[PDB]
């Protein structure tokens, strides 16, 4: 499967090398190969998967935004539209690839809260990225798929994880972005970010120095957004 002949351990090692070399397309292909071996992923390996694809899709989203801006300017030749469509299509394929890995079969095999919440968050994230470029007939159903993934992950995280858990915090952060940027629900976005921040603050006293640093890092992002949004 491009990577079907390489050992799982070698794929993981090369993913780590590509990260060091900032070769994120390679890193993604390696981690896709690792996932397709069929074994569950460790916490470190789930983070490698997320890092790889987030960087790949991140460059595509930035390109798409530059081009969409030019295209909107141009209607204030078909080339700008054609090339925005090319980038858009490549973004959608990356998102479809990640969603396919989650659906076949990472989520259904994830029984622990840390793995299951991580993967459901990712599912929400990649539907959100699809939503960012979607325009109609599917735009509503894509939004509803992101919302549903995020909501299931929130319910699990509230039952199973402490309020300072970095996965729980990154989840709540991204759901609040979803509310503000995608769902036209800025009040929900602000409420969630506030409630999330305040409940984590009240749980910080239970953490070690290194866990405190992990949690407060994400809390600051919630605060940065609240400053932007209010």
């Amino acid at each position: 499967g491009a990577m079907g002949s390489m050992e799982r351990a070698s794929l993981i090692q090369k993913a780590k090398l590509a990260e060091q070399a900032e070769r994120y397309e390679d890193m993604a292909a390696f981690m896709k190969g690792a996932v397709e071996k069929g074994e569950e992923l460790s916490c470190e390996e789930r983070n490698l998967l997320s890092v790889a694809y987030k960087n790949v899709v991140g460059g595509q989203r930035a390109a798409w935004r530059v081009l969409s801006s030019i295209e909107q300017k141009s209607n204030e030749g078909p080339e700008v539209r054609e090339y925005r469509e090319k980038v858009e299509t490549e973004l959608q394929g990356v998102c479809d690839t990640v969603l396919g890995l989650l659906d076949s079969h990472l989520i259904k095999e994830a029984g622990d809260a840390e793995s299951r919440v991580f993967y459901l968050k990712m599912k929400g994230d990649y539907y959100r990225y699809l939503a960012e470029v979607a325009t109609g007939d599917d735009k509503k159903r894509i939004i509803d798929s992101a919302r549903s993934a995020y909501q299931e992950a929130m319910d699990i995280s509230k039952k199973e994880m402490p309020p300072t858990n970095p996965i729980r915090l990154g989840l709540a952060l991204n759901f609040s972005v979803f509310h503000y940027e995608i769902a036209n629900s800025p009040e929900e976005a602000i409420s969630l970010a506030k409630t999330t921040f305040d409940e984590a603050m009240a749980d910080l006293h239970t953490l070690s120095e290194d866990s405190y640093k992990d949690s407060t890092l994400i809390m600051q992002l919630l605060r940065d957004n609240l400053t932007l949004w209010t």
Partner: peptide
Amino acid sequence: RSHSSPASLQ
């Protein structure tokens, strides 16, 4: 413009 989560979460 809104900040989202880092990819890597402990």
